[PDB]
Design a protein around this ligand. Structure first.
Ligand code: HEC
Length: 85
């Protein structure tokens, strides 16, 4: 919502591990709505925090993405998950 920036950020930073509906190394490790919901991750604040910091080995993007870029990709992930990738 910046979805335009979000889509670009996703392509350049996230698709390498999450690309095209299902993740390359995963099944429910994709960004499907139901998977996000299990751990309360289906919100702008939750995705912003995990991408910035993130968690449990998932890489932190605080160095290489600005706060605005992270907010943008968070929007993109939520919108795509709602549409169904
Ligand atoms: C590999 C080196 C990754 C890159 C680059 C990105 N992510 Fe990731 N992510 C990765 C793994 C192994 C996992 C756990 C399994 C799974 O895929 O669910 C995740 C998880 C997420 C999640 C869910 C977090 C949760 O608490 O369950 C989100 C929302 C997520 N990943 C988003 C995301 C974005 C927006 C990225 C680019 C900025 C990104 N990931 C990069 C591995 C990797």
């Amino acid at each position: 919502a910046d979805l335009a920036t979000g889509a670009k950020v996703f392509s350049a930073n996230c698709a390498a591990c999450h690309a095209g509906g299902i993740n390359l190394v995963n099944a429910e490790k994709t960004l499907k709505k139901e998977a996000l919901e299990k751990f309360g991750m289906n919100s702008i604040v939750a995705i912003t925090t995990v991408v910035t910091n993130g968690k449990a080995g998932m890489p932190a993007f605080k160095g290489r993405l600005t706060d605005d870029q992270i907010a943008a990709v968070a929007a993109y992930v939520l919108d795509q998950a709602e549409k169904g990738w």
